[PDB]
Design a protein around this ligand. Structure first.
Ligand code: HEM
Ligand SMILES: O=C(CCCCC1CCCCC1)N[C@@H](Cc1c[nH]c2ccccc12)C(=O)O
Length: 453
């Protein structure tokens, strides 16, 4: 038996299949054709793409597999360094930072961020309240304004002031370019070829821009009168219980970059996909809006009120089921092992978890997997182990999950309280890929229900 494998291109093997602006969606189509596992080869390189809960539950066994840095993350690492997202589990700075930063996502920490999330959310609601009758909303663009500003303010007491800008913040444009450069480094035979000299200068330029802003954040804090108690406070002061050490300056810098990027992009995607699915499913929108009106009785939502937005949470999880905005993660075999009783693996062999395919596993979810039905999440405990993995796995799972979900629930709740939404262009879903996923060109009209803040 040979493991299923998609079409090859001679000595380039499968590599040309990733020569596309939508590689994840291409891989999903391949997964549909070949099933729960396929081999993917390139010159000097191999991985295996997993799509079924049957195989992914084994892959999520931390005694057998550990987080691997995919080739994309290896290039992200050139500017994210040994930050949490791009560090190996066995690097000293992973476990230190993990221990040091987990308290920044405690219950008491989340209550502490609430007021500043509301600040940015109110700015969003006011922007939309202030639009003229003709005008429309550019959804992913405004969601990115919100999520970037929220992480900036909550995490670093720094105001990006994205709602004061027509263009995206220069950080965003550099970040997008740097992440695209990482996605396109995958294809290049002979990386040191003189033809790619300008891309390396452009890459060093974009990194410079992100790093310049990290300096501005550091200096703002250094010469600050106020006494914060946020993510940066913990990076600067906090001590790891195990080693007894704090993070050094080089690592703190990497953590800031990491949190700025990981701390907004996927969350903007989530809010965009959620609103997309709501406007395409009006009965679901109505149910979510009824909850928002019932629960959000005060002009400013409370922490407790956001926690009571059960259905809005269900809407968000269902959006994550269909379009998990960080759609893959990578694993390597810790020792020789046999996957599924059928596929033998040697130490160091790599796996890719194709999350959107896991989330369409019919043996877990039933036959209607393409339908947007938030009621699937009525009781989240009903979902089998390792069936729903939009925040990854185990000790290497998303540290910011609860942050992302609180922000998204708050903002979507406020959006549904304050506005009726019109899919005025009958938008055809078009998913842009930049490692992460977004509905490009998604636009709506928002008719104010006229409720004061
Ligand atoms: C919808 C929103 C989000 C999604 C879908 C998401 C998804 C993920 C996924 C899949 C991973 C695992 C990556 C891998 O195994 O290679 C991860 C890790 C991480 N996420 Fe998120 N994330 C989100 C929001 C956030 C936010 C808001 C923050 C920070 C404020 C954040 C910070 C991180 C960090 C630091 C890690 C690395 C954790 C570690 O390995 O120690 N994420 N996230
Ligand atoms: O799976 C891919 C291509 C899609 C990228 C998905 C993103 C990964 C980071 C988190 C968000 C989603 N690439 C893999 C595997 C791979 C298979 N053949 C290859 C040849 C050359 C380079 C990579 C590669 C990866 O990046 O390792």
């Amino acid at each position: 038996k040979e493991m299923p494998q998609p079409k090859t291109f001679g000595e380039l093997k499968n590599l040309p299949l990733l020569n596309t602006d939508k590689p994840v969606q291409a891989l999903m189509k391949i997964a549909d054709e070949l099933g729960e596992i396929f081999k993917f080869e390139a010159p000097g390189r191999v991985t295996r793409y997993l799509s079924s809960q049957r195989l992914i539950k084994e892959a999520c066994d931390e005694s057998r597999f550990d987080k691997n840095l995919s080739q994309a993350l290896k290039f992200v690492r050139d500017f994210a360094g040994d930050g949490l997202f791009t560090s190996w589990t066995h690097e000293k700075n992973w476990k230190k930072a993990h221990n040091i930063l987990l308290p920044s996502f405690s219950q008491q920490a989340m209550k502490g961020y609430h007021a500043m999330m509301v600040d940015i959310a109110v700015q969003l609601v006011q922007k939309w309240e202030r639009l003229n009758a003709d005008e429309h909303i550019e959804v992913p663009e405004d969601m990115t304004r919100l999520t970037l500003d929220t992480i900036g303010l909550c995490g670093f007491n720094y105001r990006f002031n994205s709602f004061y800008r027509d263009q995206p913040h220069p950080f965003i444009t550099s970040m997008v370019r740097a992440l695209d450069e990482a996605m396109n480094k995958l294809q290049r035979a002979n990386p040191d070829d003189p033809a790619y000299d300008e891309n390396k200068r452009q890459f060093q330029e974009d990194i410079k821009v992100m790093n310049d802003l990290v300096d501005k954040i550091i200096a703002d804090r250094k010469a600050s009168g106020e006494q914060s108690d946020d993510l940066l406070t913990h990076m600067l002061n906090g001590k790891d219980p195990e080693t007894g050490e704090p993070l050094d300056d080089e690592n703190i810098r990497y953590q800031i970059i990491t949190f700025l990027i990981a701390g907004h992009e996927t969350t903007s995607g989530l809010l965009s996909f959620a609103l997309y699915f709501l406007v395409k499913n009006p009965h679901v929108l109505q149910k979510a809006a009824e909850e928002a009106a019932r629960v959000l009785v005060d002009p400013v939502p409370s922490y407790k009120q956001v926690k009571q937005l059960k259905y809005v949470g269900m809407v968000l999880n269902e959006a994550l089921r269909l379009w998990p905005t960080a759609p893959a993660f990578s694993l390597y075999a810790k020792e020789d092992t046999v996957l599924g009783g059928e596929y033998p693996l040697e130490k160091g062999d790599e796996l890719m978890v194709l999350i959107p395919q896991l989330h369409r596993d019919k043996t877990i979810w039933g036959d209607d997997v393409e339908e947007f039905r938030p009621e699937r999440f009525e009781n989240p405990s009903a979902i089998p182990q390792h069936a729903f993995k939009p925040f990854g796995n185990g000790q290497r799972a998303c540290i910011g999950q609860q942050f992302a979900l609180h922000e998204a629930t708050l903002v979507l709740g406020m959006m549904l309280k304050h506005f009726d939404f019109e899919d005025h262009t009958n938008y055809e879903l078009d998913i842009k890929e930049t490692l992460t996923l977004k509905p490009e060109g998604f636009v709506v009209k928002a008719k104010s229900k006229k409720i004061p803040l």
